[PDB]
Structure 1
Amino acid sequence: NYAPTPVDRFTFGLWTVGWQGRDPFGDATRRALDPVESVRRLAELGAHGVTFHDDDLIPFGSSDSEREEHVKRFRQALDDTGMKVPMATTNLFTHPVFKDGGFTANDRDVRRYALRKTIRNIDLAVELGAETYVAWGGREGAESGGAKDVRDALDRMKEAFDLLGEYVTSQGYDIRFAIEPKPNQPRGDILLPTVGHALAFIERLERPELYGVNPEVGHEQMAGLNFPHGIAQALWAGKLFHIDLNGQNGIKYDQDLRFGAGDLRAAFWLVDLLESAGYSGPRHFDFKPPRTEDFDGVWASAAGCMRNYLILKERAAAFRADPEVQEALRASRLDELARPTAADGLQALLDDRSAFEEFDVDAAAARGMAFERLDQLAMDHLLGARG
């Protein structure tokens, strides 16, 4: 049951199942995986594709002949399996040179190098067929107030993304960018900490149509926010270019639990929203099998990401299709929420005594919203307990 197919567009970062288990307090618990073995194992589970940072595919500092051989082996694995590469990204956070940032490092020489490292990998991404190029600026930010002038850093962050936009336009590439917010970790505070801040920043870029967001479930939950609500705002803005799926238990260090773990009802409402809205992009998992696990547990945890998406898809579809839920949605006036407040226009609203002098505020206030019965129908559908 719930068996994924490439049809389902489930994708995984090489760094997810390949995470060796090093954490702030502990050494690696698993050996490194060859990307070829991750591609073949993920295909065997029913994944559609993988994604990569440059330095997951090509060891940092590789010669041009080494780079060619790493890419060649990876492409043979993709060809052998039918796996795709819909997204790629740059590692601008692991090497010590990026300790104060890539695009917003205080040192100008580092900002220029970060751009050249990104541009080299955009070319590779396009060669592998990627539609989206993610940027998670995990080193952009500060531990102390004097270290980082945030208006100057936003100027540098806009300059960088504008230059990347100029680059892909000049090359005629169709790729687009997706900025991934995170509120903190590894910096004490990270710039563009939420979906909202990233959406607002994009509006000030010179070619705003080339940029969207890549929200991650656990990152918005590290600020205690409602992830389905933030995805709804991204969809409303036409900017949900990609998404990272995982689980998180509230306001903690980024746990990257498998999808469906962490906040299970937020996972249900997220899948309901993605499917209702017809989101067509990859269902990408940015997760880490816990370092307690051996490789059988790695593949079990990856299989669980896809299984939980598919169970939640079934239950959310059954909820929306149930004539009792449709009745309850009408009882709670979800249909009215979708109607214009005043398609009659401002002067008609001003002249309408039923909106002011003749509005019976106490009779309106007496109407219950019936939200609790609606939510218990939703709980019963999620748990398969209708009856």
Structure 2
Amino acid sequence: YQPTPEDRFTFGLWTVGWQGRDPFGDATRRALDPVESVRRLAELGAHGVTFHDDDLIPFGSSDSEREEHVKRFRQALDDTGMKVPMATTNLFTHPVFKDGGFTANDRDVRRYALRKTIRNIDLAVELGAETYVAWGGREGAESGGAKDVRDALDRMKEAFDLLGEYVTSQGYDIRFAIEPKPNEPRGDILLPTVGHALAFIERLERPELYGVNPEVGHEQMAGLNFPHGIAQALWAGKLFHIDLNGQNGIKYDQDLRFGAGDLRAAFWLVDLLESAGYSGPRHFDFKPPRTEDFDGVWASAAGCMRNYLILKERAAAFRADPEVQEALRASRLDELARPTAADGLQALLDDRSAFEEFDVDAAAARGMAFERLDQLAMDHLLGAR
């Protein structure tokens, strides 16, 4: 189960680079140099890395220090063959963003947030990124009167519209992906799920430039079914990027390695991404637990990719099994894919077999055979088939 760059596995610099500072504890690991993370990830078989502006260029750096940080980084990409498919902006760490970036109540902060974003979009394009992610982690509230949400959504639309005007006027080939999260670090965060972000995009001036970047653990912090949410994003044509990790239920954002947390949900997610032909990066937004030393960091990163490849094999064996194909027909998955009324409304209204003469008790008695289908899926996941 050996990854290669063709598997398109990517990692944020902030993932393997997390020093282990949590709300109750100091860092347990020293800082990693971005150049060393690139080299170690290349050796594990990764395809590329992603970054926030402040992961790569320390906040407050002079333009001359900035050029030197970028030069060293680009040399490590050249040395390794690693790509940079995605970048994003840190609009959450510095105290100035304590009430948000794009939806801060203070107008001057909002203007600053936009300039900081636009500067990094230029750098992202220079490094070859195709997707620019926005995670509005400070956009939200702990109390009801602090944030008029209609005005805040106006400000959010204004900010994304301005970013769209900027990339189109520069002729940049880059698209935006919104990363939802329901809460943490704010008490409630605006656009809290996949669905809210999809709905918001449809009110932007150029909707074709925006999609979503859903994260496994974030939809599970609302108790939602992550493969279902991804299916709706694929259906809408909006799955531009994805963040893979693990989460044990409704609690703080754990960012466990992918495959930990809800294992059956990981299986159904991989089944869907592979069936649907998702061709974007398989990106891991995860945190090696702060119990670990650096050997544990790299073992945790390797585990992310290993678990994806094991689940990919098991999902492919499931779909290819003639006995499963039979069970899918027994459960009428084929009939779900056929139109309800391609004959049209008037024919439906005239069809007495659809109502006047429909035998409701005979249809009701038909079992769906879902439990046998699900146990076949369990046997495949466990290698008992």
| Same fold per superposition (TM over 0.5) | yes
> How far apart are the structure 2 equivalents of 1:230 and 1:82?
33
Q: Calculate the TM-score normalised by the size of structure 2.
A: 1.00
Query: How far, CA to CA, are the matches of 1:67 and 1:383 in structure 2?
Result: 50
Cα displacement (A) at 1:196: 0.0
Which ranges of structure 2 fall in alignment gaps of 5 or more residues?
none
Hey, what does 1:298 align to over in structure 2?
Answer: 297
| Residue 233 (structure 1) shift | 0.1
Unaligned 5+ runs, structure 1: none
Partners of 1:280 and 1:200 in 2: CA distance: 24
How many Å apart are 1:54 and its aligned residue?
Answer: 0.1
Question: Match of 1:250?
Answer: 249
- State the 1:24 CA deviation: 0.6
Deviation at 1:301, TM superposition (A): 0.1
Q: Which residue pairs with 1:274 in the alignment?
A: 273
1:183-198 to structure 2, matched below 5 A, reads 183-198=182-197
Partner of 2:373: 374
Report the alpha carbon displacement of residue 288 of structure 1 after superposing the two structures with TM.
0.2
Structure 2 distance, partners of 1:73, 1:226, is 42
Give the drift of 1:322. 0.3
Query: 1:233 matched to which residue of 2?
Result: 232
> Which residue of 2 is the match for residue 11 of structure 1?
10
- The 1-side partners of 2:37 and 2:241 are apart by 21
Q: Helix, strand or coil for the counterpart of 1:183?
A: coil
Aligned counterparts of 1:181 and 1:154: Cα–Cα separation in 2: 14
Question: Offset at 1:348?
Answer: 0.3
- Aligned-partner Cα distance in 2 for 1:52–1:123: 14
1:264 maps onto 2:263 in alignment: yes
Q: Deviation string for 1:279-329 (max 9, x for gaps)?
A: 000000000000000000000000000000000000000000000000000
Aligned counterparts of 1:354 and 1:261: Cα–Cα separation in 2 = 49
Aligned residues: 385
> CA offsets, 1:253-296, max 9 Å, x none?
00000000000000000000000000000000000000000000
Q: CA deviation at 1:39?
A: 0.2
Q: Displacement, 1:229?
A: 0.2
Distance 1:290 1:383 in 2: 26
Per-residue deviation, residues 119-176 of structure 1 (Å, max 9, x unmatched): 0000000000000000000000000000000000000000000000000000000100
- Runs of 4+ aligned structure 1 residues displaced above 2 Å come to none
Deviation, 1:242, is 0.1
Rounded to whole Å, the distance in 1 between the matches of 2:72 and 2:247 is 34
CA displacement at 1:333 relative to structure 2 = 0.3
SS at match of 1:249: coil
Q: Summarize deviations over 1:86-107 as a string: whole Å, max 9, x none.
A: 0000000000000000000000
Distance in 2, matches of 1:23 and 1:347, equals 62
Alpha-carbon distance, 1:6 to partner: 0.1
CA displacement at 1:343 relative to structure 2:
0.3
Q: Provide the identity percentage.
A: 99
Q: Distance in 2 between matches of 1:208 and 1:70?
A: 34
What TM-score does the superposition give when structure 1 sets the normalisation length?
0.99
Shift of 1:334: 0.3
* Alpha-carbon separation, structure 2, partners of 1:80 and 1:384: 40
2:89 matched to which residue of 1? 90
Q: CA deviation at 1:332?
A: 0.2
2:86 partner SS: strand
Which residue in the other structure is 1:331 paired with? Answer: 330
1:222-252 alpha-carbon deviations (Å, 9 max, x no partner):
0000000000000000000000000000101
Deviation at 1:65, TM superposition (A): 0.6
